[PDB]
Design a protein around this ligand. Structure first.
Ligand SMILES: Cn1c(=S)c2nc(SCCN3CCCC3)[nH]c2n(C)c1=O
Length: 503
């Protein structure tokens, strides 16, 4: 019968009800703000700040396609002029789009295949859908792309490694930038930035692929929406890089509350909660290429997430990316080979006092364990604890103003994570950051039961974060360290129950 266990989800904190009164939005040395704060009003398109386009072409900012410094060989010509000439043409067939994009990407004319775009347009779309694509949607996307200088007037700093910095920009600004990414206009981003994710969409168009046409349905749902009517809100992207981490073994904090369920999703059932993105260290993973599991799906249904790839350097072990305000534009079914775009989604989230949707997503990247027992090594357990802790902690916020963490089987698919260990690691990290946990087991009812049982066992016995961490070290030292097979003799949760009940 029972679809969920533990603390009722109704009793967990959510935004906006739990939220702090926000400070006045203003640019600072650690907060870039690309809109006119004095004119920010509910339901109105934000006005760019400054009024006139200002350019930076350097290693600390986005290199904009509209920069006068974006050149091509003719003598040098303006590549932005070339982009305008190429894209201001009628498309009636997919080859026309391919030919346009290659005009200003000539070096890639033999490297970039457009089979997946062709298949989408010719072999997936209905003829009327393809007509609407080339008569309306693509031209509207070109226009928002080419409007970039008037939209994104303020240089966008890179969120580089070790930076603790925030960018608050409009949904409209993101739309223009993403349209540029679709048309593969971002310079210097294709090459042999090896520490930044891909931003141009060329790999969405390549190869023989069934996933890619569904990815394109999802993205075109977004582009149809934001070109039909400008979006009015803001989004904040924050890189957080922590210098000091808990002494896990000495941590005297109690565990927090747990809701665990095998039904539901992070994105639908964790509304208003801190929603985990099971991230790649290159945020967004393979969203611009072949990937289509939890991170890439979130980045497709909330495409404003994708623009993080324009400016977010590969995450180090002590870092995360927190994104507040992205909008959900699509609904879907399935994942990977079964992923399908379903329909457009009208996001009903309330907005906060900075006109951000009350949706907060944190990109935290688990480790990939090629050997299963490697993850029980103390250094590896501590790495995961500290990553999750970085993702959950909000310095200078009372615990009563923190939403619950909405998560699931972080790093337990392709990355080889043990779901039971990962659950306890996230429970410990949440406890240390003084947040409750809402855990979605994605159809695994036995895992739901197991996590519930262990959590209530540890809490009833009033074990601290440190107490639990020491039991993990015990498990490593007694069952794993000197273990001579791919799996240990005794499983982790049974081991913990015995160790505590024997004491
Ligand atoms: C809780 N949760 C889960 S675990 C998840 N997995 C996916 S896609 C396949 C990825 N695999 C990674 C680890 C095992 C599954 N999408 C999901 N969503 C929306 C979700 O709420």
């Amino acid at each position: 019968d029972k679809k969920w266990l533990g603390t009722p989800i109704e009793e967990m904190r959510r935004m906006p009800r739990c939220g702090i009164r926000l400070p006045l939005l203003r640019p600072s040395a650690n907060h870039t703000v690309t809109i006119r704060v004095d004119l920010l009003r509910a339901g109105e398109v934000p006005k760019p700040f400054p009024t006139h386009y200002k350019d930076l072409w350097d290693n600390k900012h986005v290199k904009m396609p509209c920069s006068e410094q974006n050149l091509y060989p003719v003598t040098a010509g303006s590549r932005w002029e070339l982009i305008q000439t190429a894209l201001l043409n009628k498309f009636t067939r997919p080859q026309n789009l391919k030919d346009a994009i290659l005009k200003y990407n000539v070096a890639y004319s033999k490297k970039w295949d457009f089979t997946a775009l062709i298949d989408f347009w010719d072999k997936v779309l209905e003829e009327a859908e393809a007509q609407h694509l080339y008569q309306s949607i693509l031209p509207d996307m070109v226009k928002i792309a080419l409007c970039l200088p008037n939209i994104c007037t303020q240089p966008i700093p890179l969120l580089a490694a070790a930076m603790n910095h925030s960018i608050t920009m409009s949904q409209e600004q993101i739309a223009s930038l993403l349209a540029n990414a679709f048309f593969c206009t971002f310079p210097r981003r294709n090459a042999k930035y090896s520490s930044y994710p891909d931003i141009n969409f060329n790999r969405l168009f390549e190869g023989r692929s069934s996933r890619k046409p569904e990815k394109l349905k999802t993205l075109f749902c977004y582009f149809r929406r934001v070109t039909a009517a400008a979006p009015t809100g803001l989004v904040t992207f924050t890189r957080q890089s922590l210098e000091d981490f808990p002494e896990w073994e000495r941590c005297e904090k109690p565990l927090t509350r747990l809701h665990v369920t095998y039904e539901g999703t992070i994105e639908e059932n964790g509304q208003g909660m801190l929603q985990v993105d099971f991230a790649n260290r290159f945020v967004g993973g393979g969203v611009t290429s072949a990937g289509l599991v939890q991170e890439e799906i979130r980045f497709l249904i909330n495409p404003e997430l994708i623009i993080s790839r324009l400016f977010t350097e590969v995450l180090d072990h002590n870092e995360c990316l927190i994104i507040t305000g992205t909008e959900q534009y699509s609904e879907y079914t399935g994942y990977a080979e079964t992923y399908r775009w379903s329909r457009s989604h009208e996001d009903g989230s309330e907005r906060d006092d900075w006109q951000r949707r009350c949706t907060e997503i944190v990109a935290i990247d688990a480790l990939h364990f090629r050997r299963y027992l490697d993850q029980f090594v103390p250094e590896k357990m501590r790495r995961e604890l500290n990553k999750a802790y970085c993702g959950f902690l909000r310095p200078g916020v009372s615990s009563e103003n923190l939403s619950a963490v909405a998560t699931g089987n972080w790093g337990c698919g392709a990355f080889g994570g043990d779901a039971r260990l990962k659950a306890l690691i996230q429970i410990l990290a949440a406890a240390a950051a003084e947040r409750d946990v809402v855990y979605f087991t994605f159809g695994d009812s036995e895992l739901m039961r197991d996590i519930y049982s262990m959590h209530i066992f540890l809490t009833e016995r009033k074990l601290t974060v440190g107490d639990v961490y020491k039991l993990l070290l015990r498990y490593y030292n007694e069952e794993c360290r000197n273990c001579s097979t791919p799996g240990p003799d005794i499983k982790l949760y049974p081991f913990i129950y015995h160790a505590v009940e024997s004491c």
